Amino acid sequence: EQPKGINILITGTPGTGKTSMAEMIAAELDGFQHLEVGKLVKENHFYTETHIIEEKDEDRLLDFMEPIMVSRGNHVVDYHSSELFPERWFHMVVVLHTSTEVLFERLTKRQYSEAKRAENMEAEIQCICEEEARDAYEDDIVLVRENDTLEQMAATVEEIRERVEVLK
Ligand SMILES: Nc1ncnc2c1ncn2[C@@H]1O[C@H](COP(=O)(O)OP(=O)(O)O)[C@@H](O)[C@H]1O
Ligand SMILES: [Br-]
Ligand SMILES: [Br-]
Ligand SMILES: [Br-]
Ligand SMILES: [Br-]
Ligand SMILES: [Mn+2]
Ligand SMILES: [Mn+2]
Ligand SMILES: [Mn+2]
Ligand SMILES: [Mn+2]
Ligand SMILES: [Mn+2]
Ligand SMILES: [Mn+2]
Ligand SMILES: [Mn+2]
Ligand SMILES: [Mn+2]
Ligand code: NA
Ligand code: NA
C-alpha cells in the first residue's frame, strides 16, 4: 500500500538532535505526527536482549508501524537506524550530523554511560548512520544537515517545509 500522506525519516547518531527536530516539525509543520521508534521498541519489547535487535524483532516493529505509515496524515519518524524500513514509506530522509565537541557534551548531559558515549562518538566519526541511509534510499530524497545549533535546526526545518510543499 502506498502512503496516503507525506512521510519523513529523521536519522543520525544518538545525540545528533533527531527527537528535537522531529518535535519541531510536529509543532511547526501542518499535520505531522511524530513516531519515536526507540519508544516503540522499548514499549513492545521489539528486541532480543532494548539492546540486541534480531531479524524477527525488526519484522515485528515493521508490522506494528505499517498501518500508521500508510494512514491519512503526515508522519515524521525518528530513529537512529534506517536500513530496516521499506523505501515505500518515505518521501524524505534527513540525516543529522553534529561536531564531535557538541555531541560529546550532549551525550554527557543526557547521561549516557562512558562506554555508550564513546561508542556513539566513534559511530558519528565513522559516518555510520549517513552511510546506512545513503545505501538504503534514493540519493535524491536524502538530505544531510549539520545540526550543532538551534539556528541550524530551524533552517533545516525551513528547508524541509519547502520540500514538503513541493511534494504536497
Ligand atoms: N540543533 C540543536 N541545537 C542545540 N541543541 C540541540 C539541537 N538538537 C538537539 N539539541 C540538544 O541535544 C539534546 C539531545 O537531542 P535529541 O533530540 O534528544 O537527540 P537524539 O534524539 O538524536 O538522540 C536535546 O535535549 C537538546 O539539549
Ligand atoms: Br508543512
Ligand atoms: Br511514539
Ligand atoms: Br532512536
Ligand atoms: Br544553539
Ligand atoms: Mn531521541
Ligand atoms: Mn513525540
Ligand atoms: Mn533500538
Ligand atoms: Mn525481515
Ligand atoms: Mn496517520
Ligand atoms: Mn561510569
Ligand atoms: Mn546508545
Ligand atoms: Mn534500498
Ligand atoms: Na547495508
Ligand atoms: Na555501499
Ligand 1 pocket residue status of 117, Cβ below 6 Å: no
- Residues 25, 93 contacting (CB under 8 angstroms): no
Spatial CA neighbour of 145 closest among 91, 99, 113, 77? 99
What is the domain-level CATH number for residue 141? 3.40.50.300
HEC sequence for the chain = CCCCCCEEEEECCCCCCHHHHHHHHHHHCCCEEEEEHHHHHHHCCCCCCCCCCCHHHHHHHHHHHHHHHCCCCEEEEECCCCCCCCHHHCCEEEEEECCHHHHHHHHHHCCCCHHHHHHHHHHHHCCHHHHHHHHHCCHHHEEEEECCCHHHHHHHHHHHHHHHHHHC
Helix-helix angle 114-125:100-109, to 10 degrees: 150
Alpha-carbon distances of 86 from 41, 61, 70, 80, 141, rounded to whole Å: 17, 12, 12, 15, 14
Lookup result for grid cell 500500500: 1
Is 136 a known ligand-binding residue?
yes
How many domains does one find in the chain? 1
Is 79 a known ligand-binding residue?
yes
- Residues 34, 78 contacting (CB under 8 angstroms): yes
Distance of CA 128 from the midpoint of ligand 15 (Å): 11
> What domain range includes position 98?
1-168
**Which atom, in ligand 1's list, is nearest to the CA of 15?**
23
Resolution reading in Å: 1.7
Ligand 1 pocket residue status of 145, Cβ below 6 Å: no
Ligand 1 pocket residue status of 13, Cβ below 6 Å: no
- Residues 120, 112 contacting (CB under 8 angstroms): yes
